[PDB]
Amino acid sequence: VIDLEKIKFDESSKLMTVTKVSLPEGSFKRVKPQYDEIHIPAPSKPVIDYELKEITSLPDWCQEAFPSSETTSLNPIQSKVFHAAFEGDSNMLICAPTGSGKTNIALLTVLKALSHHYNPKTKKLNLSAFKIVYIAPLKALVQEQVREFQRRLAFLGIKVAELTGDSRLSRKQIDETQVLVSTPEKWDITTRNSNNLAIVELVRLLIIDEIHLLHDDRGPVLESIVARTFWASKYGQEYPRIIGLSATLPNYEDVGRFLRVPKEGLFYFDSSFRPCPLSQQFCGIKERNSLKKLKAMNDACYEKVLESINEGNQIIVFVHSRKETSRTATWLKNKFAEENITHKLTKNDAGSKQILKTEAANVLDPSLRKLIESGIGTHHAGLTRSDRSLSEDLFADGLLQVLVCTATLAWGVNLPAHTVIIKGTDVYSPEKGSWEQLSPQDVLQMLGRAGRPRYDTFGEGIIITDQSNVQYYLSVLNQQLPIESQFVSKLVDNLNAEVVAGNIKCRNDAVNWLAYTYLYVRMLASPMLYKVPDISSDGQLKKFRESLVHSALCILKEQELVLYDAENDVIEATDLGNIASSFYINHASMDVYNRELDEHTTQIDLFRIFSMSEEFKYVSVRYEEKRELKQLLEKAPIPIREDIDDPLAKVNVLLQSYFSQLKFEGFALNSDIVFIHQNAGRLLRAMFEICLKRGWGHPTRMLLNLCKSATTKMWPTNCPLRQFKTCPVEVIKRLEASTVPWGDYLQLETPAEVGRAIRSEKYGKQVYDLLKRFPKMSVTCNAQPITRSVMRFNIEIIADWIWDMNVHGSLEPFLLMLEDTDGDSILYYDVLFITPDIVGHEFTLSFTYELKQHNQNNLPPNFFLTLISENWWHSEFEIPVSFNGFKLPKKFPPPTPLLENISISTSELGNDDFSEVFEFKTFNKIQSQVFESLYNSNDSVFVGSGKGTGKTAMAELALLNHWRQNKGRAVYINPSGEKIDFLLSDWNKRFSHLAGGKIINKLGNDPSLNLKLLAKSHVLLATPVQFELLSRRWRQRKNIQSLELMIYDDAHEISQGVYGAVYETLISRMIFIATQLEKKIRFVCLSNCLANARDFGEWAGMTKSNIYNFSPSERIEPLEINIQSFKDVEHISFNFSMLQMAFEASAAAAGNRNSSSVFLPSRKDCMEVASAFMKFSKAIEWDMLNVEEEQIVPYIEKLTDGHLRAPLKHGVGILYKGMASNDERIVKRLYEYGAVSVLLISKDCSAFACKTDEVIILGTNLYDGAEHKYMPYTINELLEMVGLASGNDSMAGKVLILTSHNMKAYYKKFLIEPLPTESYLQYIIHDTLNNEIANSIIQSKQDCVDWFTYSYFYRRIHVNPSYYGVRDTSPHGISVFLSNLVETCLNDLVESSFIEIDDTTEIISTLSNGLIASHYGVSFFTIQSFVSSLSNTSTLKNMLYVLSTAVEFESVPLRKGDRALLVKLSKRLPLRFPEHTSSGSVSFKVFLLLQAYFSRLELPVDFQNDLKDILEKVVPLINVVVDILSANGYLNATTAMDLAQMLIQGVWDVDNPLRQIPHFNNKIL
Amino acid sequence: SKNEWRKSAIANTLLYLRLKNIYVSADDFVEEQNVYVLPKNLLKKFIEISDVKIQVAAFIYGMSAKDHPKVKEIKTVVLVPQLGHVGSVQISNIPDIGDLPDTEGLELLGWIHTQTEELKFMAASEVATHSKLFADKKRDCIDISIFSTPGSVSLSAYNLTDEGYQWGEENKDIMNVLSEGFEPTFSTHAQLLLSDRITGNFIIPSGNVWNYTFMGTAFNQEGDYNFKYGIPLEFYNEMHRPVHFLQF
């Protein structure tokens, strides 16, 4: 156990490790009545033995990096460093005196970094894969350097930026800039938070300005950063250019070993090399009295003010406080009026006092009106910007002889002066609740403004301080102050951060982590000052590091930040640790919040909890303040139980005062309240996050509004119109005192009522625009019980306001929160991000909640769904969910396990010819079980078997039985096109010639061909829609009812949206046919694992004996599925940690001869991850091709796609949609040959089932422009991916799924317990109903319901009426639901003239539009859209546009940012997409790509696949267009035809008739 | 003292502790007689928003159970605009909740309120304000009297009979000089059973606010208000107290 107090330095402000100071000769002490003047002369000029680089001696590409200077040459400091600083790329530390022109020194290195990205011959510069960073102490200097680096490097085209570290949302858009300038803390937070790890690798130059802060309280941060750099390099292997700029102080030696600086870069300059030699004079006041010291400073000041000014030059003066600059100005002005007022009056009354009296005479408003006329200046941090500008411009132009200013001038504006004087020095620090001497950095920075290089031969610095200080400021200003580490002070915090990052899991990790700290080196160099007991034994300081690490770590343990097994050595960060590190909070405060914060906490306690923070540790309640405070405390709006003589009360009061933006006269109070409102934000945010992670309603609810009040300086009782920067002043106060609900003003839909409400015409027209621009929404939602224990919530939201960019910014976040009846416990929460282009465009969202076990048994009344803006007042809107009563599905019945089988063989088959089909004499375990009811029985039969178990082979038996008994035509249904395509090529090689059968597939694009293909074949393969397109006229087509066997493979997708609904409709029809025509049909349904198969069985008329249904954990081989949750990824594809994890698992798998297959969201990701594989592999031990480097070369000559050259060259196979056949052959076969164990697959190519030994799933999110966000993978896709696992014989198949926290539960839940198959049929009612009406099958309303009885929907709506929106759980209610449904549908049909209802029973008959719809198979709404859009005046273009709007195109991809590509194409194509419709829609993409198709324009790999997908669905659509046109007698039909030709031959109908001919290039033409 | 609200507002913070000890004051259970069930979740929130000093009341809505129609399950509550006093309260008319969903079958069962005292009968003010409005609309409505005394709370339900309705009706004005005619025998002990299985919710005013002790200058006791589902506010919630914030 160690005492952290004993280790930290007890000497307080004076880190003087050596009382012995040394002065240069020529210095001397002159004693005076009120003080001792100890002065040092200016240093002699140095004799460098190197010639300076001339501005023109530099390379060409950088000549404008250095202005047409007054000297046009680098100075000695800048010249000596030039070699390593420009020509070399070594890390370095440059320690140089006051004002060494850091800008240029930086620019050299910047220019060097720019080198190895500048293209060889190309006179242009890669501004990609290249970033640089600049760390500076204060935000002011940061801004100054951003300015000095913006225009300075503009000629290169490089963009610079101040790192908006005050926004975590503004770190996504920051990527367009290359040069980042920022503070240590912003950078620390930025680098620490994992989400930004994506762009850290890009940085290759780091300049740390004022490194000598290592001795200051900030040091630990810089130390943490440098430690971070040299710690988790891992795969990187390259450390950025580490460059440190410092002041001249001892221990520069150690900073070298800290920053990894060799002597070739280690430089050290003394006061001699200052561009302007600075003389020193120390005024040591001797007073014992309080006030008499005021005159001691003032007299000593005046002595030096008059001394300097009397020597014909200007001076600058620094004060210890704010207003003090004007109080000092007054004293000096009066002191001269008493006497001289001549030296400060003017240098020429005829040509100086003119401007002084004319333009330099004041227009500005403050008291400066009088001051400025005496030749004095006041640069107060608080004056108006214009005043400050016009003020400093006076000192610059030589008018004002003395400038008094705040410290801020030393950091911001570069305004030099000959002599600088420091008054006060003893400054107040709210952090310590007391006073301390001015920090060294501030002194140095202030002296940074001493002298004028070009104008003056020497400058001068003068200090006014107490004789108690004397040597300290000397030790600062003469190379004596040591640079010691303060890391210990915050060691516990920086350690926590690293543990959170997963960079520390045991003590030795931290032990090794500490080795990259300045503390470590300084302890090594000097153990006697850091109080190390034994370096004798430990010399490397291993044991000590272990002790310290444990000592901090167990504090983190006991404070519940991290979880730590002291004995066995294992560390695991917790929520609190994550919040602590990621929100940059001190551990103590976090502990306080953790321990003090109850779930029952109300508003009043929260302020006290806030006050108790570590940040307010030393808040002293001074009695001087007691009166003024008590005046507030008496009349506070929120009760304070603490007494007036107690810090907590002071903090609470001051915060609540800040929320009312009150004014205080005392400096002491003001500095404090400033500090408070400064830290209050992050503190409160931390508190909120804590309350949210614990799932406590009211605490978070209140705290959010409190944070909002914290940032907006306003109470919830104030009107949000106040929040606008452009608002009516007089109006609001009339509303605040109105007692009228604010929400009632929003629905004033006119400037008149607005004008009325605010009592003003003038301001009505103004505020009217603001009301219409106020963030507001309208939401609605419902509940959907998937299963007993799971409730699905579906929401639909519209954002209703005008996005005035000026106030709203780029983004408006919103807190979504689902909570209980009481509003106490939080059930679910998420953050919605409202962007400009989603406003008005209402949309939907859905999520899963596992129902509370309490509520599961006893139905609660209602939940509450609340939505509130993260930063806008009274935007909050909440509504209830479900409530109206629901019946939860009954808990799932058990599956059907398999009894022992080592049975069934090829010999149980009658014909020996059949035995040569399956080859493998044995039948698979689960496969053998159902044999009897398939090969022998002619009954309707269902088999639900896990995907990967062998249903494919099961399907064949039904056919073999169907064939050996000479039954008739056989229909194989399957939505999986690839599988059909394979099965056609497969079956006629094994089956055709063995019993006289013709097998042939089907392209739905030509139903007429297909009909003949049906008639002309014994057995056929089709997708559901393809065959449904034929079956939908079974009445006429005789060869439909001739059928006897139908196989329904992968039937589980009857819930897979619309195509699935059609799939359902098909088998429903075939049942209806078997019934109506009496002749029975055999249904052989093959599916993967299901829930309650009973419904599915009864539905298909199955013999309940043979409706087999097995569970997922029935696999013929062993599967080991791993799933890992990662934080802050649920709104993006994937992150670095997942990538690393994946490749680790992959390579580890490959190491054991088990090749690995990785699934990714898209091709782009595959490419990126391929590159990632190359860098990953080429930097470690395992890195091989998995084959010889020699034998593989020939296949590199098969580049039918260049992209695959260099990646596959290094041992990574790639697969994507649109891939050339040769490529896919080559790569897949190479993969199978074992030429590569690392396969990368695009999600799209799940169809290309390259089964393997181990499968990996990298990310589960894929962006879609339809819903305008990221969409997650579903059970079917993921399962189809998972199915590809079979370890070599005895080896278990291994699966790795990488996803987010919000999804892991769901996946692990539904992958083991299959998700219930519900009916999507409810969405396609118009289509199927209209179609059934078209064939005069359904003629009366009753017949509709009669028809519905044959569907899965009808049998499934009874067992879960909640899911389908059934108003009444009772069967009666369900019949009512059906009746109302059908009625609404029929009215909807007749509304648009699809059907006609002949009144009386009544009778219904089809009409034109609906008949068309049913004829060609187009959606009701597409028809409706076409009818109300096509006109007798419509032209070809308009017909194309009208075509592009079809519903059938919603299934077309809309990749993230593809719009940018579409804009590029729109400039190559003549027809213009109408501007009065969103270009974020797919119709835009279709409209353009069809033109690109007509123009035979060269397209990307993505768009061509999109194009194919588009073209697939055009033929039976244009026919609908022309048929609509030709029905009204509109001759324009002849146009739509001319369009139809262009679509088939892929050319404009305007070109040479020979262009439509294959391969007729321009030469032939 | 002029700042009365402060002490009380600090005080009623710990009302959730008074729910660590609750007494179900129920007498002999009769099968023939109807019986009322009270959700725990409603008691929780209704109490922890109330006040130690000022009285507060709300309306209660419920309906008959399926298995036995005589069991009246309280399903929801309504906080109407009101202005409370110590021991007495000025509440408004019966809620107009025809607008809201699931309001088909929500039978007004009576009302529920805090008790500054600790009696075993309906009080003259209670009988008065109960007789007001409820008398000529539905005499079958009940009054749930909750002892809110420090440390622990107690629930007692009463059913006002004709004597209190007649006496209350004749008492056309809550005269401070009368206080005669009423007797402990006016009220029938109605069986009230507390249940944590059943769950209930709140119907709050459209403008959120329900307490007009700081907004009394604009308070309309006899008026129609539109309501909504939601979660209630504390008695001394910042929204109930606009005055104090603007006093700087």
Side-chain angles (χ1 to χ4, degrees), chain A residues 1504-1527:
Chain A
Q1504 67 183 350
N1505 298 312
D1506 301 336
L1507 175 61
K1508 291 167 190 177
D1509 290 341
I1510 288 162
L1511 291 172
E1512 183 180 352
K1513 298 297 185 185
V1514 181
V1515 167
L1517 194 58
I1518 187 66
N1519 286 345
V1520 171
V1521 178
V1522 61
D1523 282 9
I1524 289 166
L1525 291 166
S1526 64

mmCIF file of all heavy atoms in Angstrom, chain A residues 1504-1527:
data_model
loop_
_atom_site.group_PDB
_atom_site.id
_atom_site.type_symbol
_atom_site.label_atom_id
_atom_site.label_comp_id
_atom_site.label_asym_id
_atom_site.label_seq_id
_atom_site.Cartn_x
_atom_site.Cartn_y
_atom_site.Cartn_z
ATOM 1 N N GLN A 1504 -24.066 -1.223 -62.551
ATOM 2 C CA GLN A 1504 -24.414 -2.190 -63.589
ATOM 3 C C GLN A 1504 -25.287 -3.297 -63.000
ATOM 4 O O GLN A 1504 -26.203 -3.791 -63.654
ATOM 5 C CB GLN A 1504 -23.164 -2.784 -64.247
ATOM 6 C CG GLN A 1504 -22.323 -3.661 -63.343
ATOM 7 C CD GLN A 1504 -21.068 -4.163 -64.030
ATOM 8 O OE1 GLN A 1504 -20.908 -4.019 -65.242
ATOM 9 N NE2 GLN A 1504 -20.176 -4.771 -63.258
ATOM 10 N N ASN A 1505 -25.009 -3.674 -61.754
ATOM 11 C CA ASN A 1505 -25.819 -4.674 -61.073
ATOM 12 C C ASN A 1505 -27.171 -4.074 -60.715
ATOM 13 O O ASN A 1505 -28.220 -4.711 -60.895
ATOM 14 C CB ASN A 1505 -25.112 -5.191 -59.820
ATOM 15 C CG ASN A 1505 -23.796 -5.874 -60.136
ATOM 16 O OD1 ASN A 1505 -23.720 -6.714 -61.032
ATOM 17 N ND2 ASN A 1505 -22.753 -5.519 -59.395
ATOM 18 N N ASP A 1506 -27.143 -2.837 -60.223
ATOM 19 C CA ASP A 1506 -28.376 -2.090 -60.009
ATOM 20 C C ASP A 1506 -29.168 -2.028 -61.311
ATOM 21 O O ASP A 1506 -30.389 -2.179 -61.321
ATOM 22 C CB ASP A 1506 -28.076 -0.678 -59.511
ATOM 23 C CG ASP A 1506 -27.288 -0.672 -58.219
ATOM 24 O OD1 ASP A 1506 -27.353 -1.678 -57.479
ATOM 25 O OD2 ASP A 1506 -26.600 0.335 -57.940
ATOM 26 N N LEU A 1507 -28.448 -1.830 -62.410
ATOM 27 C CA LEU A 1507 -29.055 -1.718 -63.729
ATOM 28 C C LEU A 1507 -29.720 -3.025 -64.130
ATOM 29 O O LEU A 1507 -30.864 -3.028 -64.571
ATOM 30 C CB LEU A 1507 -28.009 -1.313 -64.770
ATOM 31 C CG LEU A 1507 -28.484 -1.284 -66.224
ATOM 32 C CD1 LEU A 1507 -29.609 -0.279 -66.401
ATOM 33 C CD2 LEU A 1507 -27.321 -0.966 -67.151
ATOM 34 N N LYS A 1508 -28.989 -4.129 -63.998
ATOM 35 C CA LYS A 1508 -29.540 -5.453 -64.271
ATOM 36 C C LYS A 1508 -30.824 -5.662 -63.466
ATOM 37 O O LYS A 1508 -31.876 -6.027 -64.019
ATOM 38 C CB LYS A 1508 -28.513 -6.532 -63.921
ATOM 39 C CG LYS A 1508 -27.301 -6.558 -64.844
ATOM 40 C CD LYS A 1508 -26.180 -7.416 -64.273
ATOM 41 C CE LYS A 1508 -24.894 -7.257 -65.072
ATOM 42 N NZ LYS A 1508 -23.767 -8.033 -64.484
ATOM 43 N N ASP A 1509 -30.731 -5.397 -62.165
ATOM 44 C CA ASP A 1509 -31.879 -5.515 -61.272
ATOM 45 C C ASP A 1509 -33.043 -4.658 -61.760
ATOM 46 O O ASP A 1509 -34.191 -5.097 -61.747
ATOM 47 C CB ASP A 1509 -31.491 -5.117 -59.847
ATOM 48 C CG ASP A 1509 -30.557 -6.121 -59.192
ATOM 49 O OD1 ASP A 1509 -30.482 -7.272 -59.671
ATOM 50 O OD2 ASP A 1509 -29.900 -5.759 -58.193
ATOM 51 N N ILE A 1510 -32.744 -3.434 -62.185
ATOM 52 C CA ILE A 1510 -33.768 -2.549 -62.732
ATOM 53 C C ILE A 1510 -34.401 -3.144 -63.988
ATOM 54 O O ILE A 1510 -35.624 -3.244 -64.084
ATOM 55 C CB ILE A 1510 -33.185 -1.157 -63.059
ATOM 56 C CG1 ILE A 1510 -32.882 -0.393 -61.773
ATOM 57 C CG2 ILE A 1510 -34.156 -0.340 -63.908
ATOM 58 C CD1 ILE A 1510 -31.933 0.769 -61.964
ATOM 59 N N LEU A 1511 -33.561 -3.539 -64.940
ATOM 60 C CA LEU A 1511 -34.022 -4.026 -66.235
ATOM 61 C C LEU A 1511 -34.905 -5.255 -66.086
ATOM 62 O O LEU A 1511 -35.872 -5.420 -66.833
ATOM 63 C CB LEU A 1511 -32.833 -4.349 -67.143
ATOM 64 C CG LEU A 1511 -32.011 -3.163 -67.650
ATOM 65 C CD1 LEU A 1511 -30.767 -3.651 -68.376
ATOM 66 C CD2 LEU A 1511 -32.841 -2.267 -68.558
ATOM 67 N N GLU A 1512 -34.561 -6.124 -65.139
ATOM 68 C CA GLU A 1512 -35.369 -7.312 -64.864
ATOM 69 C C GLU A 1512 -36.873 -7.020 -64.757
ATOM 70 O O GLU A 1512 -37.692 -7.859 -65.127
ATOM 71 C CB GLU A 1512 -34.896 -7.988 -63.572
ATOM 72 C CG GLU A 1512 -35.631 -9.288 -63.247
ATOM 73 C CD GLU A 1512 -35.147 -9.934 -61.960
ATOM 74 O OE1 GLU A 1512 -34.138 -9.462 -61.396
ATOM 75 O OE2 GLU A 1512 -35.778 -10.917 -61.513
ATOM 76 N N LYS A 1513 -37.227 -5.833 -64.267
ATOM 77 C CA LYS A 1513 -38.615 -5.520 -63.922
ATOM 78 C C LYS A 1513 -39.274 -4.486 -64.842
ATOM 79 O O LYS A 1513 -40.230 -3.819 -64.438
ATOM 80 C CB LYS A 1513 -38.677 -5.009 -62.479
ATOM 81 C CG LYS A 1513 -38.222 -6.014 -61.430
ATOM 82 C CD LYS A 1513 -39.107 -7.248 -61.392
ATOM 83 C CE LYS A 1513 -38.701 -8.180 -60.263
ATOM 84 N NZ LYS A 1513 -39.481 -9.446 -60.281
ATOM 85 N N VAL A 1514 -38.782 -4.353 -66.069
ATOM 86 C CA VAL A 1514 -39.291 -3.329 -66.982
ATOM 87 C C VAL A 1514 -40.319 -3.841 -67.997
ATOM 88 O O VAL A 1514 -41.294 -3.150 -68.291
ATOM 89 C CB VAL A 1514 -38.136 -2.668 -67.758
ATOM 90 C CG1 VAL A 1514 -38.665 -1.594 -68.692
ATOM 91 C CG2 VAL A 1514 -37.124 -2.074 -66.798
ATOM 92 N N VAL A 1515 -40.096 -5.038 -68.534
ATOM 93 C CA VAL A 1515 -40.885 -5.539 -69.662
ATOM 94 C C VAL A 1515 -42.398 -5.530 -69.407
ATOM 95 O O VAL A 1515 -43.151 -4.985 -70.212
ATOM 96 C CB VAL A 1515 -40.439 -6.972 -70.060
ATOM 97 C CG1 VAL A 1515 -41.448 -7.635 -71.005
ATOM 98 C CG2 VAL A 1515 -39.065 -6.939 -70.698
ATOM 99 N N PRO A 1516 -42.852 -6.129 -68.293
ATOM 100 C CA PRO A 1516 -44.297 -6.119 -68.040
ATOM 101 C C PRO A 1516 -44.795 -4.812 -67.422
ATOM 102 O O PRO A 1516 -45.914 -4.767 -66.912
ATOM 103 C CB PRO A 1516 -44.479 -7.286 -67.067
ATOM 104 C CG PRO A 1516 -43.207 -7.317 -66.305
ATOM 105 C CD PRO A 1516 -42.128 -6.917 -67.279
ATOM 106 N N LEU A 1517 -43.969 -3.770 -67.467
ATOM 107 C CA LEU A 1517 -44.319 -2.469 -66.902
ATOM 108 C C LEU A 1517 -44.630 -1.469 -68.021
ATOM 109 O O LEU A 1517 -45.644 -0.754 -67.997
ATOM 110 C CB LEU A 1517 -43.169 -1.965 -66.024
ATOM 111 C CG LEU A 1517 -43.399 -0.787 -65.077
ATOM 112 C CD1 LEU A 1517 -44.522 -1.077 -64.093
ATOM 113 C CD2 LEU A 1517 -42.108 -0.472 -64.336
ATOM 114 N N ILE A 1518 -43.758 -1.445 -69.021
ATOM 115 C CA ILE A 1518 -43.951 -0.574 -70.168
ATOM 116 C C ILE A 1518 -45.214 -0.999 -70.917
ATOM 117 O O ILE A 1518 -45.927 -0.163 -71.479
ATOM 118 C CB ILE A 1518 -42.722 -0.606 -71.106
ATOM 119 C CG1 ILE A 1518 -42.845 0.446 -72.213
ATOM 120 C CG2 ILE A 1518 -42.518 -1.998 -71.694
ATOM 121 C CD1 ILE A 1518 -42.805 1.871 -71.708
ATOM 122 N N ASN A 1519 -45.489 -2.302 -70.910
ATOM 123 C CA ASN A 1519 -46.718 -2.825 -71.494
ATOM 124 C C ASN A 1519 -47.936 -2.239 -70.785
ATOM 125 O O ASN A 1519 -48.944 -1.917 -71.417
ATOM 126 C CB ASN A 1519 -46.746 -4.354 -71.424
ATOM 127 C CG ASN A 1519 -45.809 -5.004 -72.430
ATOM 128 O OD1 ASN A 1519 -45.341 -4.361 -73.369
ATOM 129 N ND2 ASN A 1519 -45.546 -6.293 -72.245
ATOM 130 N N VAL A 1520 -47.827 -2.091 -69.467
ATOM 131 C CA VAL A 1520 -48.883 -1.469 -68.680
ATOM 132 C C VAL A 1520 -49.006 -0.004 -69.071
ATOM 133 O O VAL A 1520 -50.115 0.497 -69.249
ATOM 134 C CB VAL A 1520 -48.625 -1.596 -67.162
ATOM 135 C CG1 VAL A 1520 -49.612 -0.752 -66.364
ATOM 136 C CG2 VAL A 1520 -48.703 -3.049 -66.736
ATOM 137 N N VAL A 1521 -47.873 0.683 -69.195
ATOM 138 C CA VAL A 1521 -47.894 2.069 -69.669
ATOM 139 C C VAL A 1521 -48.673 2.191 -70.989
ATOM 140 O O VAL A 1521 -49.680 2.915 -71.072
ATOM 141 C CB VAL A 1521 -46.466 2.626 -69.871
ATOM 142 C CG1 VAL A 1521 -46.505 4.050 -70.423
ATOM 143 C CG2 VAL A 1521 -45.682 2.582 -68.569
ATOM 144 N N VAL A 1522 -48.213 1.475 -72.012
ATOM 145 C CA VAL A 1522 -48.822 1.572 -73.333
ATOM 146 C C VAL A 1522 -50.280 1.113 -73.305
ATOM 147 O O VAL A 1522 -51.119 1.683 -74.001
ATOM 148 C CB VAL A 1522 -48.041 0.750 -74.388
ATOM 149 C CG1 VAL A 1522 -48.010 -0.719 -74.021
ATOM 150 C CG2 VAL A 1522 -48.651 0.935 -75.774
ATOM 151 N N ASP A 1523 -50.583 0.092 -72.508
ATOM 152 C CA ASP A 1523 -51.956 -0.394 -72.416
ATOM 153 C C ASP A 1523 -52.868 0.611 -71.709
ATOM 154 O O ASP A 1523 -54.044 0.720 -72.052
ATOM 155 C CB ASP A 1523 -52.012 -1.746 -71.703
ATOM 156 C CG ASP A 1523 -51.599 -2.895 -72.605
ATOM 157 O OD1 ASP A 1523 -51.115 -2.632 -73.725
ATOM 158 O OD2 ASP A 1523 -51.788 -4.062 -72.209
ATOM 159 N N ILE A 1524 -52.339 1.333 -70.725
ATOM 160 C CA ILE A 1524 -53.098 2.419 -70.114
ATOM 161 C C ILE A 1524 -53.377 3.455 -71.188
ATOM 162 O O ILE A 1524 -54.519 3.877 -71.374
ATOM 163 C CB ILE A 1524 -52.357 3.080 -68.932
ATOM 164 C CG1 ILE A 1524 -52.319 2.143 -67.725
ATOM 165 C CG2 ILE A 1524 -53.045 4.389 -68.529
ATOM 166 C CD1 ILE A 1524 -51.338 2.572 -66.650
ATOM 167 N N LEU A 1525 -52.324 3.871 -71.887
ATOM 168 C CA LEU A 1525 -52.466 4.884 -72.926
ATOM 169 C C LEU A 1525 -53.434 4.470 -74.040
ATOM 170 O O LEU A 1525 -54.251 5.274 -74.483
ATOM 171 C CB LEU A 1525 -51.099 5.204 -73.530
ATOM 172 C CG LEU A 1525 -50.126 5.942 -72.609
ATOM 173 C CD1 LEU A 1525 -48.718 5.896 -73.176
ATOM 174 C CD2 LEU A 1525 -50.573 7.383 -72.407
ATOM 175 N N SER A 1526 -53.348 3.218 -74.481
ATOM 176 C CA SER A 1526 -54.125 2.757 -75.630
ATOM 177 C C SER A 1526 -55.583 2.452 -75.289
ATOM 178 O O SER A 1526 -56.387 2.176 -76.181
ATOM 179 C CB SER A 1526 -53.474 1.512 -76.240
ATOM 180 O OG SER A 1526 -53.479 0.430 -75.325
ATOM 181 N N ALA A 1527 -55.924 2.505 -74.006
ATOM 182 C CA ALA A 1527 -57.292 2.237 -73.573
ATOM 183 C C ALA A 1527 -58.165 3.478 -73.727
ATOM 184 O O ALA A 1527 -59.320 3.387 -74.144
ATOM 185 C CB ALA A 1527 -57.304 1.757 -72.133
#
